[PDB]
């Protein structure tokens, strides 16, 4: 779980204030592939 751990550490370190905004905009924001 080396990739599952690093991806999780950066998640809680980069998914709090920007997450609430991503969902607030996704209300109408089209899905252009993603990542």
From Swiss-Prot:
Both isoform 1 and isoform 2 are phosphorylated by the RIPK1/RIPK3 complex under necrotic conditions. This phosphorylation increases PGAM5 phosphatase activity. It comes from the Eukaryota. The chain crosses the membrane at residues 6-28. Residues 1-5 are mitochondrial matrix. The record marks 23-24 as: Cleavage. It is found in: Mitochondrion outer membrane; Mitochondrion inner membrane. Dimer. Forms a ternary complex with NFE2L2 and KEAP1. Interacts with BCL2L1 and MAP3K5. Upon TNF-induced necrosis, forms in complex with RIPK1, RIPK3 and MLKL; the formation of this complex leads to PGAM5 phosphorylation. Isoform 2, but not isoform 1, interacts with DNM1L; this interaction leads to DNM1L dephosphorylation and activation and eventually to mitochondria fragmentation. Belongs to the phosphoglycerate mutase family. BPG-dependent PGAM subfamily. Mitochondrial serine/threonine phosphatase that dephosphorylates various substrates and thus plays a role in different biological processes including cellular senescence or mitophagy. Modulates cellular senescence by regulating mitochondrial dynamics. Mechanistically, participates in mitochondrial fission through dephosphorylating DNM1L/DRP1. Additionally, dephosphorylates MFN2 in a stress-sensitive manner and consequently protects it from ubiquitination and degradation to promote mitochondrial network formation. The N-terminal 35 amino acids, including the potential transmembrane alpha-helix, function as a non-cleaved mitochondrial targeting sequence that targets the protein to the cytosolic side of the outer mitochondrial membrane. This is Serine/threonine-protein phosphatase PGAM5, mitochondrial. It comes from Homo sapiens. The chain holds residues 2 to 36 of 289 of the full protein.
């Amino acid at each position: 779980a080396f990739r599952q751990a690093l991806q999780l550490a950066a998640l809680g370190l980069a998914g709090g204030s920007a997450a609430v905004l991503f969902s607030a905009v996704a209300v109408g924001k089209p899905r252009a592939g993603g990542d």
